[PDB]
C-alpha cells in the first residue's frame, strides 16, 4: 500500500529474518559444541 506502511512492513520483515538467523546461529553453535571433545 502506502509509503508509511511499506516502511513498517519492511522493518517487520527485517525483524522476522533476523530472529530466524539468530535461531539458526544458536543451533549451529550447540551442534558444534556437542561435536567438540
Amino acid at each position: 500500500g502506502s509509503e508509511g506502511k511499506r516502511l513498517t512492513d519492511q522493518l517487520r520483515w527485517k525483524i522476522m529474518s533476523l530472529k530466524m538467523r539468530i535461531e539458526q546461529l544458536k543451533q549451529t553453535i550447540s551442534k558444534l559444541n556437542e561435536e567438540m571433545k
Binding site: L7, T8, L11, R12, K14, I15, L18, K19, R21, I22, L25, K26, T28, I29, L32, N33, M36
Partner: peptide
Amino acid sequence: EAAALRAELRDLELEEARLVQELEDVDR
C-alpha cells in the same frame, strides 16, 4: 511505532553480531 520497531531491530542486530562472534570463537 517505526521507532519501536527500529529499536527492536537494533537489539537483534547486536544479538546477531554476538552470535556470529561466538561461532567464530568455537573454532579458534
